[PDB]
């Protein structure tokens, strides 16, 4: 039955993203700074959800049939998503911060053309974890069924990769986002008019609320899996059926976040809400 649930979320995951991805390009009215980052976020989620049928098929076969390079690319996508999503959210939070606190500087510093380079900078930065993880990935003939796993030079590297990913992928971006929004709330809850007009302050507050909701959903969804990985790699918990089902539920909950964003944009943003029905009309 758990296989059906994965099928439901995956189909919605790809269904939401490409429709969102097409929309941002197919209308000049959505070329603002935030949609550039939304494009990257949707791209990352769509790539992360592309490998779901490949991985899930291995339940009933237990043998990787596709090839070693495809296992390499799947592991690479999985390891990319965790970095790219969080770094994109951090960049979004920083962008909203400069928009709120420094509107005069943001007038010249937030152009979309120069905000496009932030995406490739994010990809380059995540590439440092993408390629080595991609590098060691290659199929190895197990004790009777082909297993797509990793290899090292292991008591050192298997722990080193985990501590590095936990430190440089979760805690620092979470702290940066928290500080940014702590400044944002202080700025918002004291000034009555930001841009000097009633037609801009409302839109700015609405867009900041949307960013906050997306960030909170992402944090809630992705929190359990990192803690579970750390505790599993530290304490060496004795195996149990309940432990197995909890560990699998954590991964499922982590993956389900990729399909929520295209729907979460529908009930918070007016442009996307109207233009979804515009296609349907």
């Amino acid at each position: 039955t758990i296989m059906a649930l994965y099928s439901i979320v995956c189909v919605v995951g790809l269904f939401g993203n490409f429709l969102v991805m097409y929309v941002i390009v197919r209308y000049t009215k959505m070329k603002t700074a935030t949609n550039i980052y939304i494009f990257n976020l949707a791209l990352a989620d769509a790539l992360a959800t592309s490998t779901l049928p490949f991985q899930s098929v291995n339940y009933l076969m237990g043998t990787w049939p596709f090839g070693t390079i495809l296992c390499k690319i799947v592991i690479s996508i999985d390891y990319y998503n965790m970095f790219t999503s969080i770094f994109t959210l951090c960049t979004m939070s920083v962008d909203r911060y400069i928009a709120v606190c420094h509107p005069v500087k943001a007038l010249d510093f937030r152009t979309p053309r120069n905000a496009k380079i932030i995406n490739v900078c994010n990809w380059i930065l995540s590439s440092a974890i993408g390629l080595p993880v991609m590098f060691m990935a290659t199929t190895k003939y197990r004790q009777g069924s082909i297993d797509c796993t990793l290899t090292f030079s292991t008591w050192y590297w298997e722990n080193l990769l985990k501590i590095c990913v936990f430190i440089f992928a979760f805690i620092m971006p979470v702290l940066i986002i928290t500080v940014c929004y702590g400044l944002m709330i202080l700025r918002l809850k004291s000034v009555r008019l930001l841009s000097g007009s009633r037609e801009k302050d409302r839109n700015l507050r609405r867009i900041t609320r949307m960013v906050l909701v997306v960030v909170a959903v992402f944090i809630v969804c992705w929190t359990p899996i990192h803690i579970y990985v750390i505790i599993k790699a530290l304490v060496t918990i004795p195996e149990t059926t309940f432990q197995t089902v909890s560990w699998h539920f954590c991964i499922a909950l982590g993956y389900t976040n990729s399909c929520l964003n295209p729907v979460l944009y529908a009930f918070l943003d007016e442009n996307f809400k109207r233009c979804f029905r515009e296609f349907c009309i």
Side-chain angles (χ1 to χ4, degrees), residues 191-194 196 198 201 203-205 207-227 229-235 237-238 242-243 245-256:
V191 152
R192 250 146 163 69
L193 276 165
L194 301 173
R198 294 187 181 191
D201 166 39
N203 286 290
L204 208 156
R205 294 190 208 259
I207 219 75
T208 298
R209 204 68 79 220
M210 203 264 288
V211 174
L212 174 64
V213 168
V214 172
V215 154
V217 164
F218 183 95
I219 290 286
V220 152
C221 289
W222 270 103
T223 279
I225 183 59
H226 279 92
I227 308 284
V229 157
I230 274 282
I231 185 191
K232 199 169 189 176
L234 273 181
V235 170
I237 167 184
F242 176 78
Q243 159 272 328
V245 307
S246 54
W247 155 263
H248 267 64
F249 163 71
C250 290
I251 282 183
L253 197 40
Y255 275 18
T256 207

Side-chain angles (χ1 to χ4, degrees), residues 96-103 180 183-184 186 188 194:
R96 285 273 95 70
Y97 170 78
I98 164 175
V100 152
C101 287
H102 310 279
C180 282
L183 263 298
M184 212 89 86
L186 261 285
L188 252 54
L194 301 173

Side-chain angles (χ1 to χ4, degrees), residues 95-103 106 109-112 114-128 130-139 144 146 148-150 152 156-157:
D95 154 28
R96 285 273 95 70
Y97 170 78
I98 164 175
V100 152
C101 287
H102 310 279
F109 223 73
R110 290 186 57 239
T111 169
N114 259 328
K116 278 188 171 181
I117 84 154
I118 304 310
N119 279 349
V120 277
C121 287
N122 183 8
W123 286 113
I124 279 182
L125 220 174
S126 298
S127 216
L131 272 309
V133 153
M134 161 155 188
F135 199 2
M136 291 76 68
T138 280
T139 52
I146 301 168
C148 155
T149 89
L150 304 191
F152 302 125
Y156 193 40
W157 272 70

